[PDB]
Amino acid sequence: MLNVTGGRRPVASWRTPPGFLERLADAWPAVLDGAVEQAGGDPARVTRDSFLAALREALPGLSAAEDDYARQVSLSVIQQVRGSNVFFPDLDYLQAALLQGRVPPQELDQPRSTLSLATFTTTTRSGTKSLDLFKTTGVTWKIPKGFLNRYNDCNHEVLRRAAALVGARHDGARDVVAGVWGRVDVPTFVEACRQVLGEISADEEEYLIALASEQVQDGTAYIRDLPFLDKCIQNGKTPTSIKGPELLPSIFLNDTTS
Amino acid sequence: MREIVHIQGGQCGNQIGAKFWEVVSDEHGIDPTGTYHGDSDLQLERINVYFNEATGGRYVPRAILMDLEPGTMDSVRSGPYGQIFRPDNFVFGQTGAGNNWAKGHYTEGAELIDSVLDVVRKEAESCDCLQGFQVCHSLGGGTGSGMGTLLISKIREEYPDRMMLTFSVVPSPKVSDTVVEPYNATLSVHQLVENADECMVLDNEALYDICFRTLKLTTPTFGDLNHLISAVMSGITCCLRFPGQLNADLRKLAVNLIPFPRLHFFMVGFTPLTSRGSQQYRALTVPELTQQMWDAKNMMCAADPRHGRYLTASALFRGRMSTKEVDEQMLNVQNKNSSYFVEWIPNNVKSSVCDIPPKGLKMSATFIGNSTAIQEMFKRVSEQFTAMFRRKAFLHWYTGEGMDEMEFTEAESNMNDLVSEYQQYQDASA
Amino acid sequence: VVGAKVMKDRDGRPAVRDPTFLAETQMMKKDAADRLMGETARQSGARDTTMLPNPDVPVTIYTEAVANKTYGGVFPGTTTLNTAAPFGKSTNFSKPMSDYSKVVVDE
Amino acid sequence: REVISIHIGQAGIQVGNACWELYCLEHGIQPDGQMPSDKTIGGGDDAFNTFFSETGAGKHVPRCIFLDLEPTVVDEVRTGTYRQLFHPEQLISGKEDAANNFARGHYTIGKEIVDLALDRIRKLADNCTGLQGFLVFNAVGGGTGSGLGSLLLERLSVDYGKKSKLGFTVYPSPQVSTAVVEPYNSVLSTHSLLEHTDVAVMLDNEAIYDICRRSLDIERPTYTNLNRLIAQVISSLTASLRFDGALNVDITEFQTNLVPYPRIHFMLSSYAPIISAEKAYHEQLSVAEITNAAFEPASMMVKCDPRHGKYMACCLMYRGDVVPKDVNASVATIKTKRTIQFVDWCPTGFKCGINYQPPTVVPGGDLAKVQRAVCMISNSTAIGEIFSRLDHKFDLMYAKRAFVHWYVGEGMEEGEFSEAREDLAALEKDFEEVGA
Amino acid sequence: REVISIHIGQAGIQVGNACWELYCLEHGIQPDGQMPSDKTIGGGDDAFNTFFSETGAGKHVPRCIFLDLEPTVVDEVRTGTYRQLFHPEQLISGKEDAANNFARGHYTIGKEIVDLALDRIRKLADNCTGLQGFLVFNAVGGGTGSGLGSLLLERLSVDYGKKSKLGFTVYPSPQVSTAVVEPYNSVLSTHSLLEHTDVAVMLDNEAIYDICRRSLDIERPTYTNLNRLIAQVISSLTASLRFDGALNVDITEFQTNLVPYPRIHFMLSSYAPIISAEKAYHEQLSVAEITNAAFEPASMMVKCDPRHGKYMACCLMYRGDVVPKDVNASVATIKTKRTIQFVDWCPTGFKCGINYQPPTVVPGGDLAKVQRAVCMISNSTAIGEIFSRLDHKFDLMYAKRAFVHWYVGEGMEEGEFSEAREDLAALEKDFEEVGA
Amino acid sequence: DAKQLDMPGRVGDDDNRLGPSSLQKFDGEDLTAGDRKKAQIEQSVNWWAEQTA
Numbered sequence A: 001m002l003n004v005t006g007g008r009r010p011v012a013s014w015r016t017p018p019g020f021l022e023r024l025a026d027a028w029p030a031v032l033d034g035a036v037e038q039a040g041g042d043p044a045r046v047t048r049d050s051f052l053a054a055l056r057e058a059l060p061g062l063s064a065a066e067d068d069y070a071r072q073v074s075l076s077v078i079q080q081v082r083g084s085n086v087f088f089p090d091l092d093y094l095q096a097a098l099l100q101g102r103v104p105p106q107e108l109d110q111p112r113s114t115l116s117l118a119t120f121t122t123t124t125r126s127g128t129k130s131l132d133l134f135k136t137t138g139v140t141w142k143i144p145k146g147f148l149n150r151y152n153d154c155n156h157e158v159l160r161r162a163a164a165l166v167g168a169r170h171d172g173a174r175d176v177v178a179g180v181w182g183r184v185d186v187p188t189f190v191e192a193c194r195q196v197l198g199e200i201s202a203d204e205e206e207y208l209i210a211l212a213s214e215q216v217q218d219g220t221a222y223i224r225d226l227p228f229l230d231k232c233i234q235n236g237k238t239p240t241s242i243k244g245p246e247l248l249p250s251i252f253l254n255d256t257t258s
Numbered sequence B: 001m002r003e004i005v006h007i008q009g010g011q012c013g014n015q016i017g018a019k020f021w022e023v024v025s026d027e028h029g030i031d032p033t034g035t036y037h038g039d040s041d042l043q044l045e046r047i048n049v050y051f052n053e054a055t056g057g058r059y060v061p062r063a064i065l066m067d068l069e070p071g072t073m074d075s076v077r078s079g080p081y082g083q084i085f086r087p088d089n090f091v092f093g094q095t096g097a098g099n100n101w102a103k104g105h106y107t108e109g110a111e112l113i114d115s116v117l118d119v120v121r122k123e124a125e126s127c128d129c130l131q132g133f134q135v136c137h138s139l140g141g142g143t144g145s146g147m148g149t150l151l152i153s154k155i156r157e158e159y160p161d162r163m164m165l166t167f168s169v170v171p172s173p174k175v176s177d178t179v180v181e182p183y184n185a186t187l188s189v190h191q192l193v194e195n196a197d198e199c200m201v202l203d204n205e206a207l208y209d210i211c212f213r214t215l216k217l218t219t220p221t222f223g224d225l226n227h228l229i230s231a232v233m234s235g236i237t238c239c240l241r242f243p244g245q246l247n248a249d250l251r252k253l254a255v256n257l258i259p260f261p262r263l264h265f266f267m268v269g270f271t272p273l274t275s276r277g278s279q280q281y282r283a284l285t286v287p288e289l290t291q292q293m294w295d296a297k298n299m300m301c302a303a304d305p306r307h308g309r310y311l312t313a314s315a316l317f318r319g320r321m322s323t324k325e326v327d328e329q330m331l332n333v334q335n336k337n338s339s340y341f342v343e344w345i346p347n348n349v350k351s352s353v354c355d356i357p358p359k360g361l362k363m364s365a366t367f368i369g370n371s372t373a374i375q376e377m378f379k380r381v382s383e384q385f386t387a388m389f390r391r392k393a394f395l396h397w398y399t400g401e402g403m404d405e406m407e408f409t410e411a412e413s414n415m416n417d418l419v420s421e422y423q424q425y426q427d428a429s430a
Numbered sequence C: 001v002v003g004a005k006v007m008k009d010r011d012g013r014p015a016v017r018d019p020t021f022l023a024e025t026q027m028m029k030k031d032a033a034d035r036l037m038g039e040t041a042r043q044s045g046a047r048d049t050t051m052l053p054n055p056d057v058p059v060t061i062y063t064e065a066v067a068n069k070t071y072g073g074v075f076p077g078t079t080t081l082n083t084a085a086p087f088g089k090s091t092n093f094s095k096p097m098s099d100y101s102k103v104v105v106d107e
Numbered sequence D, E: 001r002e003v004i005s006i007h008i009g010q011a012g013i014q015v016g017n018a019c020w021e022l023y024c025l026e027h028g029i030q031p032d033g034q035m036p037s038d039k040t041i042g043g044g045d046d047a048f049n050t051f052f053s054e055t056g057a058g059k060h061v062p063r064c065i066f067l068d069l070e071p072t073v074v075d076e077v078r079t080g081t082y083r084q085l086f087h088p089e090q091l092i093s094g095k096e097d098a099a100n101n102f103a104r105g106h107y108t109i110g111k112e113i114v115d116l117a118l119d120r121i122r123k124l125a126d127n128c129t130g131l132q133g134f135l136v137f138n139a140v141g142g143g144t145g146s147g148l149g150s151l152l153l154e155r156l157s158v159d160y161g162k163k164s165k166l167g168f169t170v171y172p173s174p175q176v177s178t179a180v181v182e183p184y185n186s187v188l189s190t191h192s193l194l195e196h197t198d199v200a201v202m203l204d205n206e207a208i209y210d211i212c213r214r215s216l217d218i219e220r221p222t223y224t225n226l227n228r229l230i231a232q233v234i235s236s237l238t239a240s241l242r243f244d245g246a247l248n249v250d251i252t253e254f255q256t257n258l259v260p261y262p263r264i265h266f267m268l269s270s271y272a273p274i275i276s277a278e279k280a281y282h283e284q285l286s287v288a289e290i291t292n293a294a295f296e297p298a299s300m301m302v303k304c305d306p307r308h309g310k311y312m313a314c315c316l317m318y319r320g321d322v323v324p325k326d327v328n329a330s331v332a333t334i335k336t337k338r339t340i341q342f343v344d345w346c347p348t349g350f351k352c353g354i355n356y357q358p359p360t361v362v363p364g365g366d367l368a369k370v371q372r373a374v375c376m377i378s379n380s381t382a383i384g385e386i387f388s389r390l391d392h393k394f395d396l397m398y399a400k401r402a403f404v405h406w407y408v409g410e411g412m413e414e415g416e417f418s419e420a421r422e423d424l425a426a427l428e429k430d431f432e433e434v435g436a
Numbered sequence F: 001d002a003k004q005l006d007m008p009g010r011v012g013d014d015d016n017r018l019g020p021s022s023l024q025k026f027d028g029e030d031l032t033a034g035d036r037k038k039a040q041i042e043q044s045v046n047w048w049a050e051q052t053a
């Protein structure tokens, strides 16, 4: 099956005979006719025996290894899917598998992560996530120069305003356990920070946006923990458990300082 | 001026403490960010009893958390009103006693308690005039019971003058979690009768009974049990924190309730507590508070007081009340049920009034009755302890650690003579 | 016409039922009473719950707590950045100092 | 909190092949090794740390060693879909079988395989920091599972001594049996399973067969279905270490609250609800009845009848939609009923535990996705009935000196037979005397 | 409050299946399990809880166990319309019949099925919390209805005892009969039906044939029509448990107000009006004439004439638009009339009960939508007539020891034949003395 | 007429006066349980239809 989500399963990847791909490229439009007319006129009802016979008649050719390769690949393809194992689910899947020489084809692979000179973009389940270098690692962000002096004095008013913006009655402390403090949107947080600290430079504001957009929970739109976001912004550090495959080496081997 | 250092031991200790600090923080109007937000000035003058001003309106509680498992501390730090404690005061080990009193008293306690003693001493001299230490723990687990008990003994040896409250829940057979509950409760109680100043016996059995019969909740999770016990602790120390027409500190209550030094186990209640279907139909008078306060099905212990005699009793009231009404109700209660009160102590009811209610309530009450029905609980535990100990069940888990057989014999004998002294004081005459 | 339990009283008057008193005196469970009388109980006690974004996660008490963001407060636990598997133990605060994955944001 | 799991035998690593498939699914780890692309920048749980270790660049190599003597089933693991998941060194494999021969597996091939095995485990424990305990998996029927199984448990106990070794063993069932010399293997194994295991959990096969025949209505069950639900039991008693719960118990609690005497560690496990997808459609799941369902002998994991015995202690792991309110109500009803009876010396014979995460399904598994479940681990005297049932059919074959020449040729003598027999006799006297 | 109903025999589950059709229609249950709220105008309430349990996910399964020995009729239920309604697990089906044999059904086969049955009923009773009582449906003519029907009742009295066990039995008719060994079956069943049934209600088939011939004037009825109006009787005597009326009578009152001696519980029954869709419009239904019509022998459910007997006690259930005034007037004029007579030592020989909800109709049934109805359950000495007529033709066959070799070959002997004979003799002496 | 001029201690579910310190409103009592059970039913129906298919 090709339309399935596509998962990271390891591959077998037989080595293909040399003169096989260029001959399949022009022969397969005939093999598709042969297999269908042998299966009775409709797709998805082809036995691997009928497919091998149609292949053998369409490409006379077929030295020993060149035939054994096709037979073994067809066998793996038919077992790919759990069920009856009497027919082929997708003829196009089989064709692509036979061309690449991989049991699961190149087309069924993941989307990957783009890494332009600075940024790092990952297409995730809910939207896309991005990480801008030259000013951060996974764990520690680079704090702006004149921000902490101005933040540490008016620190608490930021959250008082952030909760008043989402509708917290600041007289009673019932709403904090009710959970209205839990849900705070990212633009509302930055707007409260603007209303508290006055003019916020574009750089410092972007710093705030980045840290909040990190700390926000996946799925929902609001942050998880406001008093924790406080010490987060104060310390300039983040509990990100930055993972391995392609982001972890690309941060610490490349020269992102200058 | 008068100060209370809070100590929470173990999982139950930490979760009770978390709801307690939430309750107090709302009473004094401090938000999760650790700054003042309230309206009345009457909240500021007596937060030195519980907090310490750090920097520009930043009050951190005077608490010391102590346990042996990471999950409990994260449950503390992750919730709201969790980012207000100081991380230095989070003395904390990570092996885990695991329902083993010997582990919590000889192996892990013996090396972790010195670091706990550092933090508690540092926070003890952080203030001027100690009123007393407030230790909240359990008697079922190990890291609460065992280490908490060694902490009590060491503190009482360092500072013997200051007061010492201990809110201890006792394992009840009706809701009995672990198997070695009696092996922990028996040894812990024996140390409590010689070290603690006064104890306030709670139990989950009566707490569940309250949430079912009186509150009539549907899903009484542990959040509400901690909710109830926390309200009890706040009601105890309202008099320190707020001006009253008749004040009553911790040492004043203790001297009015404890007639003899070994006889310091109290049963507690709270008023008002009514279901939300029945809050439409009620009134708020002092008689309306007393009828629910002295109600046997509102105590927070599983001891029916009409099975014994109230040695002494105490009542702390809060709200705009009339002292004549307060004292006439106590007199009427003492005169109607004239058999459940001891003879050789006339006027067995100490009382006090404070003018500041909890936020949103009009009037409230808190009861502390030192009865002789508490020997019902200790006999109920000691009979299970001797049931196992006649047969050395589970005994190897302690004996293979440094404990011997004599510790169990003396612990049972100390439990035996205590319920003997309670029986004799119940059967005394004049 | 399905027959009610208590249809009419001694006089010829229809009966308006009080689900809250039933939920109190456990004559029926509240979870049943609300669904059975969804019209009055919504007016009497009930309101809707907040749902997780992913429907594959089972819906239980703790999942509703973590949905409406009262998880850490009502229930002793630790809040998690992920929401597909909410109750994953996270011990960043308690991790020893030399642990290979330990940040010091809280301290 | 960290725990490593060693598997000894062809049954051990088939159970492990089902257990680890369940663990990767519970933590969202793709079978090639690493979490999906969503969790690459910020990540998440940090719960996996007790079973996996985050290696290198996007890999989570589990904390276990499969070990066997024939390379057949091990290479099946090496060539399956989990080629990438297990480090190559961890999957140990000898050259020739022990072949249902305890002596062969204990004196002939053990001496060269166990040194490599424990020199791997040592560097696994050194990578570990907060080791909770080991947990072993073996069937005492064969030769590898019993022979070097016993040899490994012996050398583990001399290297560590007091560390908790949870032993999930598989005995031969009374009637459904697949070998002939398995009585000899079982008796010679239990003489060291008594003395080196901390807590042992019996798992007979015909009991699980009746479970799949009756409850899950799988009319033709293979071994993969058995190993699937055995994995469910392991997952349910370790979920407290992995995910946070309202009332947690670790591995140290089992040793504390279920072993009243150091020589009595044999636990009849159980599980509920074992329900198919159609009976779940018809039957409601509430804490009261699944607590009852965990106590009936038609849902235990060992073919024995506790109505003949007296419960010593009981442990109850709950997962999912569970409040302490009703579990206290349920254990109340259990303790007031009299269709089951406890031992007099234990008056508080229960221990509950609650976790938040409900058990998962495995695609291809037949259990329905439920909101709650219960795993009981009890202790009784029905186990003492099992050992004598096995002791009799060992003494039958030993009276005529059947098959003895195989063991004596491989290196032992007949003093081992006499001493293993009188050990079972002493253990029988111990169980009868405790139950009084 | 809950009441769970067990059914024993091929007539048991056919009666059970007309009852449960009527119950599902009364509480608006679609046969696939759920109730559509839109279609039913009636107000919603938890009245259904005494039969259906809120199971699974928005599903209601009855509190019932069909049990039979032939797989034919049970598997026919599993293939019919109500497939998804019942459990697959509650319909207990044996593999081989008792085949018109109390012996085969009480000694040989009962000992295998009774353990599975009553160790399932324990799980239903555990699901209940306010269990009112069991009620049994059986025909005593067959083998499993008689044999293990008595074995079930015996082990019920041992297991529970104080919970009420209402019995609705079906005796063979005097002249219309389907079997030959039924005298032996009925006698050997009734010896235990004496001391183990709490309240027994007799139901004969020719009497019901008379009803459908005379009143409903269906000239060619089947067992379904018999099953249908028997379900009308059962529904109308549990309606007080289900729907509260002006004067309710629960299941504990029949025991109190109709059983003057612990060994005298056999109740004539009746029903009125049993009226087709065309006599309904013409006849004006009022409380007076339906109280009259429920008292003639032309309208009873047992072929006997109480004119030869004395009414020991009576019980009148009313449904629909009944005020207490006229029901009190009708019971007054019955008390004054001398065509029937009450026993002298019982002066107040009535117990009325009134429920507001009218009895429902089954679309495709034969009854019309009726405003008000009466279900009488009385007690007399005409039952002493029935058992003596049956005892005559039991000793008739037993004189030549006919068919005896069947029972002796199954495991019986001659002693229980003798003692079951003289037991009916003592009971006859009992009824003749009480009627004095 | 202090009794007659006084409000009831708790007025309904949402009440601005009733914080956590005052014990008139408990979190443990939940009025959302009714609909939460409905959500459970929907989840189970979907899951088991999928598994059956």
Ligand SMILES: Nc1nc2c(ncn2[C@@H]2O[C@H](COP(=O)(O)OP(=O)(O)OP(=O)(O)O)[C@@H](O)[C@H]2O)c(=O)[nH]1
Pocket: D008, D009, D010, D011, D012, D014, D015, D069, D070, D097, D098, D099, D100, D101, D139, D141, D142, D143, D144, D145, D146, D170, D171, D172, D178, D205, D223, D224, D226, D227
């Ligand atoms: N529960 C369970 N038992 C199994 C399974 N597979 C094999 N067994 C048991 O394994 C026992 C025989 O030993 P094996 O595991 O087959 O082989 P061995 O233990 O490695 O001994 P050798 O054959 O000498 O290598 C039998 O009693 C089976 O019950 C399984 O998948 N599940």
Ligand SMILES: Nc1nc2c(ncn2[C@@H]2O[C@H](COP(=O)(O)OP(=O)(O)OP(=O)(O)O)[C@@H](O)[C@H]2O)c(=O)[nH]1
Pocket: E008, E009, E010, E011, E012, E014, E015, E068, E069, E070, E097, E098, E099, E100, E101, E139, E141, E142, E143, E144, E145, E146, E170, E172, E178, E179, E204, E205, E223, E224, E226, E227
């Ligand atoms: N009233 C009534 N009686 C029935 C009905 N169906 C069967 N019977 C009676 O059932 C009696 C015999 O028992 P059956 O139910 O036929 O068979 P059984 O009870 O399973 O006993 P075995 O045939 O030996 O297995 C006969 O007297 C029939 O009159 C019915 O629908 N209504």
Ligand SMILES: Nc1nc2c(ncn2[C@@H]2O[C@H](COP(=O)(O)OP(=O)(O)O)[C@@H](O)[C@H]2O)c(=O)[nH]1
Pocket: B009, B010, B011, B012, B013, B015, B016, B099, B138, B140, B141, B142, B143, B144, B145, B169, B171, B175, B176, B177, B178, B204, B222, B225, B226
């Ligand atoms: N009131 C209350 N009791 C609790 C709580 N948690 C556990 N318990 C009780 O404490 C006993 C076990 O205590 P445990 O957790 O082992 O104490 P610790 O481990 O030393 O902190 C059990 O009987 C529980 O019923 C809680 O949060 N509140």
Ligand SMILES: [Mg+2]
Pocket: D009, D010, D011, D142, D143, D144
């Ligand atoms: Mg093998």
Ligand SMILES: [Mg+2]
Pocket: E009, E010, E097, E099, E142, E143, E144
């Ligand atoms: Mg039949």
